[PDB]
Design an enzyme around this catalytic site. Sequence first.
Site, PDB file in Angstrom:
ATOM      1  CG  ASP B 148      33.875  -9.790 -36.398  1.00 43.05           C
ATOM      2  OD1 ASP B 148      33.783  -9.896 -37.640  1.00 43.05           O
ATOM      3  OD2 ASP B 148      33.945 -10.786 -35.639  1.00 43.05           O
ATOM      4  CG  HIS B 150      33.744 -13.927 -34.382  1.00 44.71           C
ATOM      5  ND1 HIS B 150      34.139 -13.601 -35.659  1.00 44.71           N
ATOM      6  CD2 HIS B 150      33.041 -15.078 -34.488  1.00 44.71           C
ATOM      7  CE1 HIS B 150      33.668 -14.498 -36.505  1.00 44.71           C
ATOM      8  NE2 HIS B 150      33.006 -15.410 -35.820  1.00 44.71           N
ATOM      9  CB  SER B 236      33.587 -18.989 -36.176  1.00 42.58           C
ATOM     10  OG  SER B 236      32.537 -18.101 -35.834  1.00 42.58           O
TER      11      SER B 236
HETATM   12 NI    NI Z   1      36.592 -16.342 -37.416  1.00 47.13          NI
END
Ligand code: NI
Lengths: 316, 430
Positions: B148, B150, B236
């Site tokens: 991912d 993030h 985010s």
């Molecule tokens: Ni998120």
Amino acid sequence: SNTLIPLAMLYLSYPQSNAQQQIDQWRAAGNPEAGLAQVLLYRTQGTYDQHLGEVEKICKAALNTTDICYVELATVYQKRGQADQQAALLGQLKSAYARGAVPATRVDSVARVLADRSLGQTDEKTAKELLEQVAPANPASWVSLAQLVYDFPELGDTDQLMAYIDKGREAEQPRAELLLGRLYYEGKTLPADAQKAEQHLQAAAEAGEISAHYYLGQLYRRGYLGNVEPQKAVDHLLAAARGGQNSADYALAQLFSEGHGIRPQPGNAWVFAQLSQANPTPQSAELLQQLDQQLTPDQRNQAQQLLDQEKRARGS
Amino acid sequence: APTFSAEPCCQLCPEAHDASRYTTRYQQNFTTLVQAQGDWLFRTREDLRTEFNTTPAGYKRLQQVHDAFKKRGVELVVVYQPTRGLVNRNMLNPAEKAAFDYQKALGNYQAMLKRFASMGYNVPDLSPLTNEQLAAADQGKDFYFRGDQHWTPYGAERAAKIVADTVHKMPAFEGIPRKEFETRKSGRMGKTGTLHNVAGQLCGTSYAVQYMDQFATEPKLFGDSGNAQITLVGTSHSGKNYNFSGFLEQYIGADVLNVAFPGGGLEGSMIQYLGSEEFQKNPPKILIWEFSPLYRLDQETIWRQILGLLDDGCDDRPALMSASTTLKPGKNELMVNIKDLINRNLQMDVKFEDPSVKVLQATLWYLNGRHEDIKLEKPETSDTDGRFVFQMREDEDWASQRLLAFEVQGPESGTQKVEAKLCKRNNFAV
Ligand code: NI
Ligand SMILES: [Cl-]
Ligand code: NI
Ligand code: NI
Ligand code: NI
Ligand code: NI
Ligand code: NI
């Protein structure tokens, strides 16, 4: 005498010999253990819930000679929602335990009946009050208290729960390790900690509880520690299954099917879905049909070979 | 007696190396995926880039934005995320680990940080976090999720320590009330990573969920606090999932107003906050702005909006022209100009009665049919203000063109109330 009840246990446990008529003869003849024997018949034939009124008659007759009936009566009163009769029974049980007539473990088992959600509405506060009064003389009930507070957080926070587990882990009850493992596994009364879970479940599994094996298998399967560990998952789930946990077999069939970091192997998934059928579910047979339609005949035959070779688990 | 074995499955299929296959716009942010240790994947174009630069127009706009915030009394702390490659190169497989020019990418990343610092921005130096090699006791606490884009909460915390160092050395931090905080593990999350999903549909495969600790930060007679004087604007990456603002509160030692939201990108959170009355009634001493090299820093329609908002749009100000109209489907002529309205001195302020309006599609008409078609889009992941603010165009010869008309496209069906003011800019005062 311990005569009629072991004989009924023999006549039922292997029907290679009627039993109800023999109990009716022992009762018409007036032999005082006839009622206990017929309650045993009810439990073994699975009709117990159909004759609760007669169970009450028998055990209220036999209560002062046969303290196991304290557990039976309590069960009846939990099933039929009779709070008044239950209060009366618990009063006479507290009295009997004070008089020295009933052992503390009988109080423990009655308390655990009062908190059995599967019987109807529980009386968990009364259960706690009984266990706290026999725990000093019966250390196992500490773990009972620890489990009660766990299922009913109403009655105690995590510090209270840990105090109980520590007073019982003096006896080092393996159940206590199992409870700590489950507490860190389930993330219900505490934030989930997979490492502490693994440690306490390992302690529990080295001490007997095959259910710790189920939890460890799931833990390595999902990867809560950070990584999936396929072989460890298979090994521990398999030990749980070979120990009598049915949910394990289905778990293994899921493990060999879903991918999610574990290489799908349809044949072994097949073997374990078949094993899971012992207590079948819709999802069980539906997985079984999908897998079966995915295999070839030669694969199916090799899979039947492993299936038969695994039912050759002497296990006795 | 029988033995049953299990295996970890599924190196990236060779077909995912084919750039031909990342056709959709979404897939284009993953071009191309490469396999690394474990189930670490990497996006070559974004994670393994070596170039961190923008155009001169971009730098000029960034300078103007800094100076405009400064006139409003706001210092900015730029949090410019180092790439997944820069930080977690040591999880790469040998071939890609040897092809990635970490020294060049490190130098160029540091150079872009120095460029930010040269314009007046406060720039926490996050390069020491690159080339991560966790201590043995932190084995699973990687800066980034394996599949991912993030950071994990641990990456956010590590960045927050450096950001707090920067804030403590800042003169603006004087006068900011101090507060103690406590940060604890609060639960667990399971990330199905975007890279793993894209990989999975390209190869017909399946990835395990990566589990990760969640954290929470709590404030530990008249001990209650007033309003935050530090605001965090972001993406985010600054959302609740990773507790970036929690860690900032913990290490700065002060309240932080978090106005990030997922899908905001470079400018969504910022645009929504600048239009807010919180910013205009309680402007912060310190604004921490979180983004990454993923966003082009030379979009003129973004900075025309941010700069219009930094000048408070068109309110408390005489209108040059105004419109209070009900848009119908098709073209709607709001205002028709006599007065010498010079693009370089003008701003437009447009509010819809309906706060759910996310798109403004409009046309600014100048002399002899010369026109600018504008399309401003709000993020669809947050409740926004139905308000669009923008300076007239000033590049090339546009700055001198005289404004003749303003029209707006109606809705596909129905009617929509709108209000529009044309005004002169001030010099980013009150
Ligand atoms: Ni998120
Ligand atoms: Cl029970
Ligand atoms: Ni088995
Ligand atoms: Ni799946
Ligand atoms: Ni400055
Ligand atoms: Ni400091
Ligand atoms: Ni046109």
